[PDB]
Swiss-Prot record:
Parts forming coiled coils: none
Domain of life: Bacteria
Keyword Zinc annotated: yes
Gene name of this polypeptide: manA
Active site feature: 275
InterPro entries noted in UniProt: Man6P_Isoase-1 (IPR001250), Mannose-6-P_Isomerase (IPR016305), MPI_cupin_dom (IPR049071), Pmannose_isomerase-type1_CS (IPR018050), PMI_typeI_cat (IPR046457), PMI_typeI_hel (IPR046458), RmlC-like_jellyroll (IPR014710), RmlC_Cupin_sf (IPR011051)
Leading EC class: isomerase
Catalytic activity: D-mannose 6-phosphate = D-fructose 6-phosphate
Cofactor: Zn(2+)
Protein name: Mannose-6-phosphate isomerase
Subcellular location: Cytoplasm
Length: 392
């Protein structure tokens, strides 16, 4: 068939919501597993499937047998595989603070760690592959996140109340610049024993006298990470509440965390994660610091500003690994075409896809794969369809 309704995998990671995918889309969960991510792609750990003829086949296998026709020549020649994973993320508790190195450093780090025979599944294995990990989140319900350093004057204001927590806070307040921000970031994550306990005590008392954000976000995080030095991170990093339909790009070398709510996430293919708190795992502070850009991002530059052309709302992404757009649906068909493979996902309403004689209906939460050779398709109905594709 031209258009292929996807059979997608749900990752039941312990941190997933037991209800979000059911409340949103009617996805079954009678056994009440945590449902953390709904995956749409060709990931080797659990590829989406397509129906051939009766049988189902792995999308990954289907693509591997026919890369040019399925991916298009540009993506096949640049990446050699579907270059993204698209997911619904349903964060029922706050997740870890993460940084993804840039492509060059990822290549350098992947090598370093190979040339010292570090086991893959080991604690200190920072670079699992040589790829960068650009990511976009697009809010499906109100979506609370941290992303990027605050303006230095903002950090200064927020740290005043906890100046006695740690000498590195005083040091930064004395001269609030990128060097001392770096030292502060690293000192906080390296806090131990009485040093850490004193700092956490001062912060917890501040939660009694300081109201509103980001103190409220610290309170929310403390439910799940009561003894984590990452509880100070909302004072250094922007706290953003995305409304449904808003999006943000997670740049390289930039700390971020997904704290609450449901989002679509599009990500390049990498498992390179340098954690930066809100985690029980060992953190390599020097390697983290060497891969963080200590440059404020002001609040008004955090969201991706999309561009509306006809029925298409494009969210410009500054990497080649993926592109992302939203499409309004109406009675009159709209043509949705691309040079690459596409995944189309029904956000809300109901989508009728048509390619010549074939008609495929998607309800909210369902998705289809469109191979490059099958572009374009016509879409009608009501609501909105999200598309992940490549603009090369
Ligand atoms: Zn990330």
């Amino acid at each position: 068939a031209s258009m292929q309704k996807l059979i997608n995998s749900v990752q039941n990671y312990a941190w997933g919501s037991k209800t979000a995918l059911t409340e949103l889309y009617g996805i079954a969960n009678p056994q009440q597993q945590p449902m953390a991510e709904l995956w749409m792609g060709a990931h080797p750990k659990s590829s989406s499937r397509i129906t051939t003829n009766g049988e189902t086949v792995s999308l990954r296998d289907a693509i591997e047998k026919n890369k040019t026709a399925m991916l298009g020549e540009a993506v096949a020649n640049r990446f050699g595989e579907l270059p993204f994973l698209f997911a619904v993320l349903c964060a029922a508790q706050p997740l870890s603070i993460q940084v993804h190195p840039n492509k060059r450093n990822s290549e350098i780090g992947f090598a370093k760690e190979n040339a010292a025979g570090i086991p893959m599944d080991a604690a200190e294995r920072n670079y699992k592959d040589p790829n960068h990990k650009p990511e976009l989140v697009f809010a499906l319900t109100p979506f609370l996140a941290m992303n990027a350093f605050r303006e230095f004057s903002d950090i200064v204001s927020l740290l005043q109340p906890v100046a006695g927590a740690h000498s590195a806070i005083a040091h930064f307040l004395q001269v609030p610049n990128a060097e001392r921000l770096s030292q502060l970031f690293a000192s906080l994550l390296n806090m131990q024993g009485e040093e850490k306990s004193r700092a956490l005590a001062v912060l917890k008392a501040a939660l009694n006298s300081q109201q509103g954000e980001p103190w409220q976000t610290i309170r929310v995080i403390s439910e799940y990470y009561p003894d984590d030095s990452g509880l100070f991170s909302p004072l250094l990093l922007n706290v953003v509440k995305l409304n449904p339909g808003e999006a943000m790009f997670l740049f390289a070398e930039t700390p971020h965390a997904y704290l609450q709510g449901v989002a679509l996430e599009v990500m390049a293919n990498s498992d390179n994660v340098l954690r930066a708190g809100l985690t029980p795992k060992y953190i390599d502070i020097p390697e983290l610091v060497a891969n963080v850009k200590f440059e404020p991002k002001p609040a008004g530059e955090l969201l991706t500003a999309p561009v509306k052309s006809g029925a298409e709302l494009d969210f410009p992404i500054p990497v080649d690994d993926f592109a992302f757009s939203l499409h309004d649906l109406a009675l009159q068909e709209t043509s949705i075409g691309q040079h690459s493979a596409a995944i189309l996902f029904c956000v809300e309403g109901e989508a009728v896809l048509r390619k010549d004689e074939q008609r495929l209906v998607l309800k909210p939460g369902e998705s289809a794969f469109i191979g490059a050779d099958e572009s374009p398709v016509n879409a009608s109905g009501t609501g909105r369809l999200a598309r992940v594709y490549n603009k090369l």
